[PDB]
């Protein structure tokens, strides 16, 4: 799946942004879309979704996170090398002229030892080549340290001698850009270097962020295993309101819960060992933790606890997946209960993402019933959120086939309830659909076009909300359809 | 300190035991003191004793533990190489022959690739060199693995490419010994091989065992930081019987205690960090955990708890150091209190060690009053232990000067109360006293001689118990001496 990121998406992102720059100038906006804008992002499930797949192990999740950082480092080194060839201009600003002489007189500040012939070829008056030269040395380490970590678990290459954060990486790049501008070469700067900067903000150091997904009941079994071992009873047998109470006492509580001598099934171990892996790896390599089969706020707090109690210093925000009819009905109720908890609200800090499954919905109820429930499950959740001042971000689980939420991109967005998108949405691109959308250069470009053009239009100029007549009919029809199905 | 272990104690232990053999034969025993008897053992505080020395960090303890295993393997290598030169016999028993052919035909069984010039060299009918050769290969790995574990986080050299357990190291050596006996060359077996085996039982894979020692109140500080953070209360202000009651609830309980977000002073981080080090290193590298300024049973239970709550999987046995007069008086009562606790009784499993301090005693009470309280301290603790079915081992903290329990070894042991030794004792050999005892070969032999002969005699042929008249006069004089001092 990463072959696609490499072959069409990597180069296909700056090209699409540059058209937006042109599209914008054509309506009188006299500036390009700023490079710190993530107008389009990429994320993966490829080593993270374990829902009903025992073969995605904690070690797998770790491999994928490091493989990615290795692929990413490699791509950037390629891009940086091309750029060195190009930025042969001598005119630089003062803050770059100082930094360049540090790295020149010291021979790269002894970071890599690998590109050392290069540090003896470099002529004095190529300030850009010298900054980027150093960026490259640090990139090679970032790449190699990921290899050593993947093969051994440890590296002779320190952290400081490589790029640890996206900000550390951006620093010299944004410098180069500001220098070229200060010297009046904003045109040169808006060339290869603008395309590169946009890639850093877009793709970051791990290329794609990893969503983790796990079955709802799997967390229940881990927590029931804890309550049993401590002799507080069976977490499984507790009513939902009892679970919420207990969990919140614990979340607020300062005392450790998870006992090391806890007896575990292979299944409980796969779950706990997964959080363990999440806790070692850099936070910027992860997206959200997705709970498949999500049903009530317990399921969300259950993870929040398991995550904190397994040592995840900076926890992945937890997103519920409403995949069945019943759960999508009780959904905006679930979302409000979570929003109404003093603890949970300090945790999320105004941002709540939730996933809606088109796949296992149409399997539960009819196609018609599912599509309609999914409509107002979005509509209402948005309403609950707007009321509690939380920025909702809907995650759409769409497939390729029509009966899994498939269909032309702009239509699928058009058909989503008004005022429930607003510049923030996520959509799955599943299996063969990656080839459908990103197989060729032009396909990738149109795929970014479709999503971006529809999302925009949908937010500035939404579709008509349904008439009260229509709603009633859809309500009554869905029950018929669901029963017939 | 280890230079003494190397230069006199290493070769000198097997020589002393061979004298014990001969002395056994001179009283008509017709048997060698079985090589599994540790008639004399060596432990170390050098890198473990933290009392009043902040310079003994957790990291110091880790360095000392690995350094020792390195030293140990490096001595076992030199010995094994000589032994290979020696056991050139071709007669072996079936078990050795089988293993010998496995190793021979596999070119070493894939262990090191070092000493590969030796394997090609190895002729067929030299079985002892074969097993031993592999034993050597495996030793090289053991000392290297320590080097890499010391010099950096971990090593390429695996766990089962080297010796991990003393039983794994003894397996092939004992096979050799039984082979040579089976072929009627036991006379050869009692030669250099016997001397090595006795070093394996006497020194193990770490050479000497590290005693950890820490102040009493320093553990109190940790447990008060936890009860304060969790809002349980102030452990420090709790009375002794309350401390015991709380600690025992926690020890019986299965739920974790120590919060990972616990605020720590630098001292508190040196306590917990130390336990963390013990948690990692192999258990067979440590002796006990010694509590200086031990006063009441709370101190012992406090460490038993901190030890578990820091994840020390197989915990060190806890010994209290009664350094001062008031503590030596309560001492037997503390000991009885610690017994009679159904939890603590199952932990120790019939074995309890306690240290008595000869240095800090005389400072507190004065020479005569100390020396006497020390006498009946051991006497009554014996009786309590005896009543509870517990083997009391006494650790004597002596040293050079007469004012610190100094004096001739055989006389000091004579001066100790009857029936409080019974072939189980530990004594400090402090600093310069090591040169006094182990500075020369003859000195080392003479020193093992005194300790072995005094302790044996004292067990079977005790000194006299004091007459009641004498006892009363001692109690009375003790008070008078204390007050005057």
Describe the structure.
The structure is cut from a larger assembly and holds 2 copies of chain A (485 residues). By secondary structure, chain A is α/β, with parallel strands linked by helices. Chain A folds into 2 domains: 1-69 and 207-462, no CATH class; 70-206, Phosphoenolpyruvate/pyruvate domain (de novo design (two linked rop proteins), Up-down Bundle), CATH 1.20.1440. Helix content of chain A is 57%, strand content 8%. Chain A has 21 helices and 7 strands. Chain A has a 7-stranded parallel sheet. The longest helix of chain A is centred in the first third of the chain and has 29 residues, at 58-86. Chains A and B meet through loops of A and loops of B.
List key phrases describing it:
part of a larger assembly, 2 chains, 485 residues, alpha/beta, de novo design (two linked rop proteins), 2 domains, seven-stranded parallel β-sheet, 7 strands, photosynthesis (chains A, B)
């Amino acid at each position: 799946g990463m072959s696609y990121i490499h072959e069409t998406v990597w180069k296909g992102v700056p090209k699409f942004l540059r058209r937006v720059d042109t599209a914008l100038k054509n309506i009188g906006i006299n500036e390009r879309l700023p490079y710190n804008v993530s107008l389009i992002r990429f994320s993966s499930w490829m080593g993270g979704d374990r829902d009903g797949n025992p073969r995605v192990t904690p070690e797998v999740t770790r491999d994928v996170c490091l493989l990615a950082r290795m692929m990413a480092a490699n791509l950037y080194i390629d891009q940086i090398e091309e750029l060195m060839f190009e930025l042969s201009m001598w005119r630089c600003n003062d803050e770059l002229r100082v930094r360049a002489e540090e790295l020149h007189s010291s021979s790269g500040s002894k970071v890599t030892k690998y590109y050392i012939e290069f540090w003896k070829q470099i002529p004095p008056n190529e300030p850009y080549r010298v900054i980027l030269g150093h960026v490259r040395d640090k990139l090679y380490n970032t790449r190699e340290r990921a290899r050593h970590l993947l093969a051994s678990g440890v590296s002779e290459i320190s952290a400081e001698s490589s790029f640890t954060s996206i900000e550390e990486f951006l620093e010299p790049l944004e410098l180069c850009y500001k220098s070229l501008c200060d010297c009046g070469d904003k045109a040169i700067a808006d060339g290869s270097l603008l395309d590169l900067l946009r890639q850093v903000f877009t793709f970051g150091l791990s290329l794609v962020k990893l969503d983790i997904r796990q079955e709802s009941e799997r967390h229940t079994d881990v927590i029931d295993a804890i309550t049993t071992h401590l002799g507080i009873g069976s977490y499984r047998e507790w009513s939902e309101d009892k679970r919420q109470e207990w969990l919140l006492s614990e979340l607020r509580g300062k005392r450790p819960l998870l006992p090391p001598d806890l007896p575990q099934t292979e299944e409980i171990a796969d779950v706990i060992g997964a959080f363990h892996v999440l806790a070692e790896l850099p936070p910027d390599s992860f997206g959200p933790y997705i709970i498949s089969m999500a049903t009530a706020p317990s399921d969300v707090l259950a993870v929040e606890l398991l995550q904190r109690e397994c040592g995840v210093r900076q926890p992945l925000p937890v997103v519920p997946l409403f995949e069945r009819l019943a759960d999508l009905q009780s959904a905006p109720a679930s979302v409000e209960r979570l929003f109404s908890v003093d603890w949970y609200m300090d945790r999320i800090k105004g941002k709540q993402q939730v996933m809606v499954g088109y796949s296992d919905s149409g399997k539960d109820a009819g196609r018609l019933s599912a599509a309609w429930q999914l409509y107002r499950a979005q509509e209402e959740m948005a309403q609950v959120a707007k009321r509690y001042g939380v920025k909702l971000t809907l995650f759409h689980g769409r497939g390729g086939t029509v009966g899994r939420g498939g269909g032309p991109t702009h239509l699928a967005i058009l058909s989503q309830p008004p005022d429930t998108i607003n510049g923030s949405i996520r959509v799955t691109v599943q299996g063969e659909v990656i080839e459908f959308c990103f197989g060729e250069e032009h396909l990738c470009f149109q795929t970014l076009q479709r999503f971006t053009a529809a999302t925009l239009e949908h937010g500035m100029h939404p579709p008509v909300s349904p008439k009260p007549e229509w709603r009633k009919l859809m309500d009554e029809m869905a029950v018929v359809a669901t029963e017939e199905y």
